[PDB]
Swiss-Prot record:
One of its GO terms (molecular function) is copper ion binding. Optimum temperature is 55 degrees Celsius with 2,6-DMP as substrate. It comes from Escherichia coli (strain K12). This is Multicopper oxidase CueO. Binds 4 Cu cations per monomer. Contains a mononuclear type 1 (T1) or 'blue' copper site, and a trinuclear copper center consisting of one type 2 (T2) or 'normal' copper site, and two type 3 (T3) or 'binuclear' copper sites. Cu cation 1 binds at residues 73, 405. Induction: By CueR, in response to increasing copper concentrations.
Length: 476
């Protein structure tokens, strides 16, 4: 059979009441011919791409048609805590919440997803995620590929696993609280190995790793390069040519890739050195999508310069905040041994060469920051507004992957896990790798967040977030 075409999320803009309507609901999807209950925004699975313009405000009306509580967070968008949609931003089942977003940051591909307390991993796994396309005046002058669904395409890559009856098989248990929820089936905008027909010339891909726990590493099947033009928070100063592009959970990059007549090629993900993630079929390069060239000229450009990146300031005299991540040693070893028992030595491929004892030992609060599992009632500190800070995040003490995300900002990485950041990671980021080492980022918060609607900072390995590896903080 031919491959299905890559599904393209609808690009949604406001009505004359300046409103965008998002309905959160359950429906059905099909994967490998078997139906599964799934959740979506304005549909059965995934969600639309909300289009925003710098300097314009939009109101979003969010209708929760699930039978459980949820929240809606705009990952990458810098907004006041009251509309950030962290775990305090509850939307009752059958209820509606509206937020007004006053967009105040450069053009970027951001995304949105649930942030329900202790249940974010399940709600993402069931299907909820959407996109945000921010434009500003600067980016349109560059004449990048811009025809949505033709030469400018979002690529949301996610794994799932399913039970024998076809349903999504999600469990937050000791093994996944240790290693994360991951599966054996790769989805690309919800579809298994789709094709996308693209015109000859440049193709812009807005890549999102939407997996709960799996890191990815994109490349092409015939080793043509990817030209990185943007990271989480917007354009780089100039394109950065790469042969492979590691992407952590929740990160975005936009790349341009050449499309040549008569030569289809795949976007692939290459095996990663992360526990559990190189079990078949991920022990080998895995196709994500086939690009099918069409013999019609594509109009977009890859300009020499994209934007101005300001200089890092002096670090002297900046507040230094220490964030020590930790996992419970006994429960990390138990979960890792369950993984090994299940899959054997392949569960560590690529890596460097039973009774109830009560609430004290419960894995639901095993993961922590500064010795505390997330306490929604007690923000850990009060950050400065409009002031740079140096946040130092340590994963010393364990070797698991912690893509560390901070709400309310786009930051600059000073050190990523003990090395200066790669050039394509040296611009605006909202995620930094922490794995067995220490990262340092330079952050500034331009908006307030009170205790009742605090900003979060957490690992975006969702099963770790949901079992305590998150803190709240206020601004202003
Ligand atoms: Cu996120
Ligand atoms: Cu976020
Ligand atoms: Cu978050
Ligand atoms: O987030
Ligand atoms: O998040």
């Amino acid at each position: 059979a031919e491959r299905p075409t890559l599904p393209i999320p609808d690009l949604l803009t406001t009505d004359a009441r300046n409103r965008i309507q998002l309905t959160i609901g359950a429906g059905q999807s099909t994967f490998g011919g078997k139906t599964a209950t799934t959740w979506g925004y304005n549909g059965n699975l995934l969600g639309p791409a909300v289009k925003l313009q710098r300097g314009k405000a939009v109101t979003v009306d969010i209708y929760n048609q699930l039978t459980e509580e949820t929240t809606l967070h705009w990952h990458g968008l810098e907004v006041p805590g009251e509309v950030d949609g962290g775990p305090q931003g509850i939307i009752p089942p059958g209820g509606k919440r509206s937020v007004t977003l006053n967009v105040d940051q450069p053009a970027a591909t951001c995304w949105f997803h649930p942030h329900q307390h202790g249940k974010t991993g399940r709600q993402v796994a069931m299907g909820l995620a959407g996109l945000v396309v921010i434009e500003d005046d600067e980016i349109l002058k560059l004449m990048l590929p811009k025809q949505w669904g033709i030469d400018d395409v979002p690529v949301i890559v996610q794994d799932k696993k399913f039970s024998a009856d076809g349903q999504i098989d999600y469990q937050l248990d000791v093994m996944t609280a240790a290693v994360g929820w991951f599966g054996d089936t790769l989805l690309t905008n919800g579809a298994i190995y789709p094709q996308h027909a693209a015109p000859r010339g440049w193709l812009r891909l807005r890549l999102l790793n939407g997996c709960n726990a799996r890191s990815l590493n994109f490349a092409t099947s015939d080793n043509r390069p990817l030209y990185v033009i943007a990271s989480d928070g917007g354009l780089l100063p100039e394109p950065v040519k790469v042969s492979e592009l590691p992407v952590l959970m929740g990160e975005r990059f936009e790349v341009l890739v050449e499309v040549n007549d008569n030569k289809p090629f795949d976007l692939v993900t290459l095996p990663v050195s992360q526990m559990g993630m190189a079990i078949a079929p991920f022990d080998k390069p895995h196709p994500v999508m086939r690009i099918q060239p069409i013999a019609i000229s594509a109009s977009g450009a890859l300009p020499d310069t994209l934007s101005s990146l300001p200089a890092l300031p002096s670090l002297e005299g900046l507040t230094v905040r220490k964030l020590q991540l930790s996992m419970d040693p006994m429960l990390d070893m138990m979960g890792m041994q369950m993984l090994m028992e299940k899959y054997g030595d392949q569960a560590m491929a690529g890596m460097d060469h039973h009774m109830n004892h009560g609430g004290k030992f419960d894995f639901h609060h095993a993961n922590k920051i500064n010795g505390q599992a997330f306490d929604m009632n007690k923000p850990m500190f009060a950050a400065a507004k409009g002031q740079y800070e140096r946040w130092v995040i340590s994963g010393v003490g364990d070797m698991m992957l912690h893509p560390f995300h901070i709400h309310g900002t786009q930051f600059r990485i000073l050190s990523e896990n003990g090395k200066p950041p790669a050039a394509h990671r040296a611009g605006w980021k909202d995620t930094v790798k922490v794995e067995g080492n220490v990262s340092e980022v330079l952050v500034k918060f331009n908006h307030d967040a009170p205790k009742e609607h605090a900003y979060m900072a957490h690992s975006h390995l969702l099963e770790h977030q949901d079992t305590g590896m998150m803190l709240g903080f206020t601004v202003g």
